[PDB]
A paper describes a structure:
Human multidrug resistance protein 5 (hMRP5) effluxes anticancer and antivirus drugs, driving multidrug resistance. To uncover the mechanism of hMRP5, we determine six distinct cryo-EM structures, revealing an autoinhibitory N-terminal peptide that must dissociate to permit subsequent substrate recruitment. Human MRP5 was demonstrated to play a critical function in regulating cellular cyclic GMP (cGMP) homeostasis, which is essential for many physiological processes, including the maintenance of vascular smooth muscle tone and cardiac contractility. hMRP5 also influences signaling transduction pathways and may contribute to drug resistance in anticancer and antivirus therapy.
The first group consisted of hydrophobic amino acids, including Trp240 (TM2), Tyr244 (TM2), Phe288 (TM3), Val293 (TM3), Phe452 (TM6), Phe988 (TM9), Met992 (TM9), Phe1091 (TM11), and Phe1145 (TM12), which applied hydrophobic forces on the peptide. However, the C46-S64-derived EM density was absent in the hMRP5-m6 binding pocket, confirming the importance of hydrophobic residues in anchoring the C46-S64 peptide.
Author numbering: 95 to 501, 573 to 787, 839 to 1169, 1179 to 1432
Write the structure that this text describes.
Amino acid sequence: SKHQHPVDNAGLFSCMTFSWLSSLARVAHKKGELSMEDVWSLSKHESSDVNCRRLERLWQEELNEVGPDAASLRRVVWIFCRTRLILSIVCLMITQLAGFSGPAFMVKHLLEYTQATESNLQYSLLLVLGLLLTEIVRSWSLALTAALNYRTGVRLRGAILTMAFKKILKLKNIKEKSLGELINICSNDGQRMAEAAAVGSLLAGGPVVAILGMIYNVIILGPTGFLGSAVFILFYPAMMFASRLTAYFRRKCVAATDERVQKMNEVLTYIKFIKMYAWVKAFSQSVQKIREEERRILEKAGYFQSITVGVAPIVVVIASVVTFSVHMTLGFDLTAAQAFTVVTVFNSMTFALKVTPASVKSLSEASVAVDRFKSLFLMEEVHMIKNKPASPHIKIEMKNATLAWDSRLQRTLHSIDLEIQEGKLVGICGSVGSGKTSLISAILGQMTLLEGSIAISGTFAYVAQQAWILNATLRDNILFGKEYDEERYNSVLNSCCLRPDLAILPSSDLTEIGERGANLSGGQRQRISLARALYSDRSIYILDDPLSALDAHVGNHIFNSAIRKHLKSKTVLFVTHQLQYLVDCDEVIFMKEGCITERGTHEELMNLNGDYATIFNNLLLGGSVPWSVYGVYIQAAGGPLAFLVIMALFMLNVGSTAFSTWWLSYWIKQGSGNTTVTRGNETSVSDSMKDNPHMQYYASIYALSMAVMLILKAIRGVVFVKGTLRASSRLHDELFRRILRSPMKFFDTTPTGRILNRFSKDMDEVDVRLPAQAEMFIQNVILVFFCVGMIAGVFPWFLVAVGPLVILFSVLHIVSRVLIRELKRLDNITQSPFLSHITSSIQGLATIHAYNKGQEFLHRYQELLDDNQAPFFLATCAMRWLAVRLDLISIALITTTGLMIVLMHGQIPPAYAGLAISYAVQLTGLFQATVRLASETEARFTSVERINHYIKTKNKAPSPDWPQEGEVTFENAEMRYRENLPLVLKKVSFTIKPKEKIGIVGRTGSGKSSLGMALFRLVELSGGCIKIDGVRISDIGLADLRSKLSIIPQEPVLFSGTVRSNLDPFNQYTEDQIWDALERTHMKECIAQLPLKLESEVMENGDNFSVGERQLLCIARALLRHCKILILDEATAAMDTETDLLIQETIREAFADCTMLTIAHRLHTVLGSDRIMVLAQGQVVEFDTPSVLLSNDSSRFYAMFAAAENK
């Protein structure tokens, strides 16, 4: 025994057969759920610390030997992994030698014995035992070499991830890389390296058995054997070519699918505007046009992908046909054993296309990860000041320090003579870019030194800008790895006045805040950072501006409560940006261009009449998938007929190869037509296929069988893709149709992102991932069924031997895959906390570096890495554990087939026995693929299930001229937003009459926002009646209702595409009317100067236009329709001193001859209206015209107007 982990306790046989996992497999099967407690802890050999130390030692050794610039991290990886890679390579060599010598020798000798006229029992038994032993030791050696590299990949990932984390923690240039790269390299590069070391180490595998096969087939045959090798070496860079073509088709049309996702997001977020404008048909047409363009390249991508999914038997059949059709017709002889040895070795070399491309892609990923890690390891490292001042009273000492920045020595500071003393309240103020932040960073230690010296005699309590903080509960953010003291905690809370924050928070001390703060604000974040700094109890406090945008009153209160009183015995480096915080400061310094100009306390600062005094004066002045899915999936695919057609086509595709093999066996068995050939003085029939009179007929039938197989494969490839894509298209169309027609309440309750997830992730998965795995699963299942049926046909006793084996396979399947699903779930729910403490760590590094808490952070990161890697290691080992048990069935089937062949010697033709053993040795590696494909399809069906259930859960004839007038009346309308919700409309009744300027305004939540969509009938009326032009709103069609109405929302909304498309999506309005509307809204010149003349294209939300132009575009909208009732919402504050007035001028100039149901929350912009109503809590209380309402002081509206004037 070496460790508590059963992996170390396992010897040779247990490790080879993965017997250690059958102590957790049983408990997982019995309980049905695997938790982190049941998962064994990581071994000390695979522990992060030891492997990281070894990797660092090797890296430093190579850096010292070769050089910082000429070193290679690939050499470091090779040196680290050589010990566990050499033995794995040897094991792969021996297992691939056994797997090649099995069919080449054991099958050939067995078939030669079958053709022999004698009958030997001991020899046949010895041959069967030898073949069984060879296959058993091949499978076991493969399992051993997989387990050997699985551990070293995990240990390499663990060693490199912590080293990368330490490097990014100790780097100086935080902004050198991006946010999405530092997190990716510490979370995905390690996994890429692990999977590379796991699967790509077999690069010396498939190729070596392939070249061994090429060397073979030339001794038994003649020169014809080179044609079989040429066929393989031309077919490989054809499946590779198809894979490259499908990869090129991928990452293409991704722009189209991103445009579709953006359009769906725009139609979901701005669904109120579209539903209030009847712009549904045009948007639906737009998305249909985008989708049909997407599934025009998606169809080709699927066509090219479906070629290389099941090529395992097709390549062997093609090579055999090409070899035999020219070997027989050239006069050469061919026997059953001679012909079937080539087929068996071709099937053996077939076990390269499944692994080699994956190995190459893993090696490429490992190489690019190594290059990126090397680039990470070559940047400058941050430094910490260790020199101390000669006088202990001096805290920070620096004399004539250049202290250049980086870009590299970027000169920013010049001749700084700081003499900071212990216990001071100084402040370094200056212009932006003069070197204030540069000086702060230099004090922290992230600055290089050229001339002078830097002396620090204490730790830094530095708070960073933007308040990065941590990503945990609001208790460790204040302690920051310190002992919890009640008195200190209460003092810190009282100093920073955090009691109201705790009171308003739901969980108070237990409240959880994200990396940036979800239920938090900038001021609260800064207060939390200040509290953490106060509780830190350090010597020097590097106080970066905490109150730049926090507040004034409470900011001064916390400043004079904590910085002045609590922070008296500690050094203060408070940056200052307002200049009233240094009235009590001990020494005020003002530095410009990196040089100190004024020193001393404040009194000298004003009496010297410097720049600081001028600035101060200026500032003072200023799961299981049910059967419903499978069924509906196929029902959406076209019903039972489509599934039956697909199944029949797959069976025909497999049966093409099956019939080719059967015809080859028939040609071998038929002999020379039972004719006699004169070989001299003896004439006694013949036993050579070359003497068969109908040899050309057999060759032609073989060639036709190959052609038919190719045609069937092409037909399946071009049909199955269409069948699996039409289902996705129909599902997407139905989902869009039901979502667009669904009440708005579905949008208010269900989040927009949740709906969008069904069109960006679920839809893409359904389109590209699930059909790909389903095709291979179906192909493997049909191939296995056909092989089993044909094997049983030759010997009518395979069913009785396979029945118990089928039961064993079913028992294995039900026992397993549960510890796989649970292990994957555990890996995900341990990697999510691994993304925690990583995204936060990269987001904020200056605070960590200044506080010197880089050791406990690294320890926590290593602990998280180990607790995430252990489930990953177990999950990786589970695949090989299942593969061993499935091989225990595969080799058993092969042994049973061989025993049946040897027992029935003389009653079975050699070709029939040979085909059986060829298919038996072809059965290898099929159950392992089949179960994995079934599990993957079951997992992928969760997306289809999530998509599903979403589609599950006249009277009055309007006049052609309606509305002739703009008369609006309300008859005690009763309305509510949703059921079981507080009422928003309470017996509201009023009269508008055409030609009005209603200036509706009320308190928040009173019901002002309800009006608008209330008139448009976004949700059905719960009571009351509303009449337009004497006609009730109800009992009218949706288009008729929301087609003669217009409204401009609060925030301008613009759709991506074309300006013409935004102005006229239906394309039925004349250009002259559009230009007249633009002229009336004052657009003309500034929009006519565009190079494309209004076809200039608009980005998302109109990001290429100014805010004023964005508002003016929406103002110009609804002018073309010349609608009567306008329900223009709030203008979202005033824009400048002229743009707002111009907008108002255009607004009243355009909509002058019609009603004006404008809603504005500003009392200054509502003045001059013809008549204004005031609605409070859903009741009308004031209808008497602003003017008349004004004279009356008792009216509320006058009180609000006076309050607004006062404020």
